[PDB]
Design a protein around this nucleic acid. Structure first.
Ligand SMILES: [Mg+2]
Lengths: 98, 151, 114, 127, 100, 82, 206
RNA sequence: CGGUCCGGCCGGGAACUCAAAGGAGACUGCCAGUGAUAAACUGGAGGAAGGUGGGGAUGACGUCAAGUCAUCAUGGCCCUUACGACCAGGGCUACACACGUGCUACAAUGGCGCAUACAAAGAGAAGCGACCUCGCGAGAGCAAGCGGACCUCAUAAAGUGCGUCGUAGUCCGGAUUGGAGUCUGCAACUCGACUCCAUGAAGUCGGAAUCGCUAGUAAUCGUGGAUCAGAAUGCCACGGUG
């Protein structure tokens, strides 16, 4: 019914946010199927460390794209309202598929 | 290695018979990593030898190897300008391997139409002591014999 | 046996025999075989003259051997006196298709001189 | 009774489900000669069974994901061993001696930076 | 790169912004099989006449901070070196000096 | 190489010039920077000075020229010998 | 010249992220550039007032920027109109309406960036460089820094050859990843050339 | 387990690979000998893991006035109706050569034809593009789905199962040179690939010399990606044999 996806670059922070979301769900609404971590989209970015020459030198970087899905197959009027405004995501991109 | 002396990795026996030596031979034959082709070739070679000799496939393999393996092997010492190629007692572990390698080389050299057939022929030659690997072994021994003088 | 200008070694398989003739190759050979109704497995040995004739006709239908060479040679000649990039390359003995002439142009050039 | 066995080799993940009696070998809804091509691989898969005196005594329903051919076979073998361990957990002495309980630390070493392969340096002129 | 270079691409970008739909429609009809031949011809010459700077082909994407076209990145929009510099300062979210 | 469905290259200016020449009946050397143009049946008889980099070289248009571009006939690179 | 940039190896370990926002690949680069521009603007504006670094966070397309400063008396000013004005320009730069938060750094000499800035200033108004460096280190020690390494490079005192000069006091564990190494660089635009002031300050072990 | 299109497909089942959060867990801790009674060493057991378990990031003092003042910033010196800028094309792809570095080769462990097996890791809404249709085919139309473990790009290829050819310059290798077409983009002529037809150069393991690699390593087969309208034998990575 309602699929809420949580997207952040830091893992601990994402976990925290997920927990917060779960808490929000539990109080106001019903059911909730908790946190399910989806495979980390690892953005392998290789950068030449030197501006001029030096092929052997490469700085190897990675963006950890963390995905968290909390699944609820039950809509309540109280909780749908207190989720769009009551979330406190801070640095997490929350996508609520209604 | 300058420092490390380690016990070597375990190699599993041959599927058809149950031989480590056979597996080693197959490995020696194989390059690029194509083991299953090499293994098949080896099997084919064994079959033809059995068809010819009328003996056990492994036993025949063994006596051929025996016929091509040396007891003494030369090794360079490089102390002076002149060659100090000292002969040394070869361990039974690596001797076998060397023989196998020689056999493989001989097979490679040979000009029969199937590679399996080539190596079968090589085996046959070894059994009757007349092939290329055996010849190589002979002169190696001769070389050692000549310079067995050194210690 | 003569199929389109030049002679063919009788030992060979169908697909390969046709290839020996200038202008026709493997796919061409296959096509010819399909047109005929015969498979590639049969050699020049074990073939009736009638069967051969059809094959020959089919080969003729395609621009083959001498005529094709003439067409190509004539085209080359035309290019030459036109004097385009294609033409001067031909005149010089240098790559046309888009190769590095600096290094590895050795097919059109041949062996190294100095 | 049903028993589970997990299998790993290089990149492969294998499941092994063991049930006593009848004696069946099933790999992804197929037989061993049906599913696997190489004889060596088959032998290796049979290898843990081979040591012990069990032929028709247990059925094996197995599913394998990832890996290769020989690697896959190895993973399967590992899974089987795990299952066997789960079944008894007293005949480990033989297995350890054999070298079957250990999952390969021999694994995909990553392609390196500035180097042509995993350990291979690019062929270079000294001067 | 040079300031001039930066200016050039800015101009090109602006042109692209202006001309795209007009460009797009022409492309569409060029593609179309069910279309008049004379009309197609007309479209093609229009395209030929219409600016080269308006084309996304002339759009050589540069560093949005400095101006370097070489070592561009669609994630960050910057020079490789510049990205690294940013990253180390902590100025990029996600990008870790990581291992796998 | 382009698709025949898409349509081979013609520059407008040069086409116009060609048309003028045809109407005019003057022919003679005609200046050309844009080397991408395909040779047309109306262009046969006209001499066209194609830009090769430093200089314009006049190449006479023939019937053996239809499926070609002008800049191919322009020796855009120059070489004598080592 | 060789080593890792310490702030970039510790960004997911001990150092909190300077950039704290999520954006899609479609909308990442531009956002980053905007952030950079804002940073630049801040640098331009509050160089005379003592600033160190800023942390950027944008939830629900409404940015909150955290500013790490030494003295709030000049940074905020006497009234919150200047702050509002500043916000406006940030908003203009970015797109969406802008909000900011200010943070006063406790122990200004514990933070490296401020110290570096001070050093740069000293260099500019012509003081003995070595002596200044020494003074800085002493101050840091007084303040309770467990370790401090400073490093200046090149064209020192108008010499025809570059001068690499560095002072090290206490313990500066650059290799310990669980160490709180606060590292910053300020590059002096002097009359004789460019002097690069590098500074690591070891705060604590966690 | 019940139920059936014999599809995980499903009423269901949350058991387990999986997934990634929090951890346990490997420490010379355990047994012995050696050894100054110590550090420690050489073994042994248990144990998934062994003496740093593997790999990576990690580069102290500093060297070479090492590289870059064309990422950036810079002290200055100079051009300042020109050493400045805008456009158009040419080029940077030249070509008697000399070298370096990658790739395909010389064959039957093979080449190809015809059946068939195993993935891993990626990348995507001015995007990927099932299904159906037409094209030898690259690709088109047609029309769903997926901000994407769901939709896709992509069938992994070696391997296996048959068939052949019978060591030839070969059914090796595919170069080059031409022809017929398809996308991409304002536009492939210098100057993109690719679909195809032909064509069949050198080369039958390479002189002196030299180079990499200690185990999932080399060797070797494929699969991605990043810069890309467009274009990798490079590079970064993922996996198969081994
Ligand atoms: Mg050479």
């Amino acid at each position: 019914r309602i699929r809420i996806r949580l997207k952040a670059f830091d893992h601990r922070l994402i976990d925290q946010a997920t927990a917060e979301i779960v808490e929000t769900a539990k109080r106001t609404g019903a059911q909730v199927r908790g946190p399910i971590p989806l495979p980390t989209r690892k953005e392998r970015f290789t950068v030449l460390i030197s501006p001029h020459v030096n092929k052997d030198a490469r700085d190897q970087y990675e963006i950890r794209t963390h995905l968290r899905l909390v699944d609820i197959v039950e809509p309540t009027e109280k909780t749908v309202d207190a989720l769009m405004r009551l979330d406190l995501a801070a640095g997490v991109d929350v996508q609520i598929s209604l | 290695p300058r420092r490390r002396v380690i016990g070597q990795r375990k190699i599993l026996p041959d599927p058809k018979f149950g031989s480590e030596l056979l597996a080693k031979f197959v490995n020696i034959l194989m390059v690029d990593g194509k083991k299953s082709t090499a293994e098949s070739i080896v099997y084919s070679a064994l079959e033809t030898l059995a068809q010819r000799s009328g003996k056990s496939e492994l036993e025949a393999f063994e006596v051929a190897l025996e016929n091509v393996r040396p007891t003494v092997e030369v090794k360079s010492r490089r102390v002076g300008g002149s060659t100090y190629q000292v002969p040394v007692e070869v361990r039974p572990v690596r001797r076998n391997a060397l023989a196998m390698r020689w056999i493989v080389e001989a097979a490679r050299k040979r000009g029969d139409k199937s590679m399996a057939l080539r190596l079968a022929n090589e085996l046959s030659d070894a059994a009757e002591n007349k092939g290329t690997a055996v010849k190589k072994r002979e002169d190696v021994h001769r070389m050692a014999e000549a310079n067995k003088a050194f210690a | 046996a003569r199929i389109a200008g030049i002679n063919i070694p009788d030992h060979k398989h169908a697909v390969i025999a046709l290839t020996s003739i200038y202008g026709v190759g493997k796919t061409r050979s296959k096509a010819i075989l399909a047109a005929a109704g015969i498979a590639e497995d049969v050699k020049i040995s074990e073939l009736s003259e009638g069967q051969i004739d059809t094959l020959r006709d089919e080969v003729a239908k395609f621009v083959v051997e001498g005529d094709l060479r003439r067409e190509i040679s004539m085209s080359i000649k035309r290019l030459m006196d036109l004097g385009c990039y294609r033409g001067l390359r031909h005149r010089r003995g240098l790559p046309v298709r888009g190769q590095r002439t600096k290094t590895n142009a050795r097919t059109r050039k041949g062996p190294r001189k100095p | 009774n049903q028993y589970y066995g997990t299998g790993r080799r290089k990149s492969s993940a294998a499941r092994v489900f063991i049930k006593p009696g009848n004696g069946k070998i099933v790999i992804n809804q197929r037989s061993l000669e049906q599913y696997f091509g190489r004889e060596t691989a088959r032998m290796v898969v049979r290898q843990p069974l081979e040591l012990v005196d069990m032929v028709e005594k247990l059925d094996l329903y197995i599913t394998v994901k990832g890996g290769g051919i020989s690697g896959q076979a190895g993973a399967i073998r590992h899974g089987i061993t795990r299952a066997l361990m789960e079944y008894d957990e007293s005949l480990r002495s033989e297995l350890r001696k054999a070298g079957f309980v250990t999952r390969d630390a021999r694994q995909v070493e990553r392609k390196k930076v500035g180097l042509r392969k995993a350990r291979r340096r690019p062929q270079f002129s000294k001067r | 790169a040079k300031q001039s270079m930066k200016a050039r691409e800015v101009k090109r970008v602006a042109l692209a912004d202006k001309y795209f739909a007009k460009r797009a429609e022409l492309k569409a009809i060029i593609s179309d099989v069910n279309a008049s031949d004379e009309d197609r011809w007309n479209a093609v010459l229009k395209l030929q006449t219409l600016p080269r700077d308006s084309s996304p082909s002339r759009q050589r994407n540069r560093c949005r901070q400095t101006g370097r076209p070489h070592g561009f990145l669609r994630k960050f929009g910057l020079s490789r070196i510049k990205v690294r510099e940013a990253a180390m300062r902590g100025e990029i979210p996600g990008l870790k000096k990581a291992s796998w | 190489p382009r698709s025949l469905k898409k349509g081979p290259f013609i520059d407008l200016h040069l086409l116009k010039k060609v048309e003028k020449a045809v109407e005019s009946g003057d022919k003679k050397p005609l200046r050309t920077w844009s080397r991408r143009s395909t040779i047309f049946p109306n262009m046969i008889g006209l001499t066209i000075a194609v830009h090769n980099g430093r200089q314009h070289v006049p190449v006479f248009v023939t019937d053996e020229m239809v499926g070609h571009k002008l800049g191919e006939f322009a020796p855009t690179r120059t070489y004598r010998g080592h | 010249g060789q080593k890792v940039h310490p702030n970039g190896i510790r960004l997911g370990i001990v150092k909190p992220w300077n950039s704290t926002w999520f954006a899609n690949t479609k909308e990442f680069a531009d956002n980053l550039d905007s952030d950079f521009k804002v940073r630049q603007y801040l640098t331009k504006e509050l160089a005379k007032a003592s600033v160190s670094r800023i942390v950027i966070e944008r939830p629900a397309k409404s940015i909150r920027v955290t500013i790490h400063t030494a003295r709030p008396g000049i940074v905020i000013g006497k009234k919150g109109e200047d702050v509002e004005k500043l916000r406006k320009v940030v908003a203009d730069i970015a797109g969406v309406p802008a909000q900011i938060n200010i943070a006063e750094v406790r122990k200004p000499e514990l933070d490296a960036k401020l110290v570096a800035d001070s050093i740069t200033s000293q260099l500019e108004r012509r003081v003995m460089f070595r002596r200044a460096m020494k003074r800085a280190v002493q101050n840091a020690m007084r303040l309770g820094a467990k370790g401090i390494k400073v490093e200046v490079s090149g064209r020192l005192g108008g010499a025809e050859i570059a001068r690499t000069e560095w002072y090290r006091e206490g313990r500066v564990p650059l290799h310990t990843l669980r160490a709180d190494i606060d590292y910053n660089t300020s590059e002096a635009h002097t009359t004789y050339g460019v002097i690069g002031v590098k500074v690591w300050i070891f705060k604590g072990e966690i």
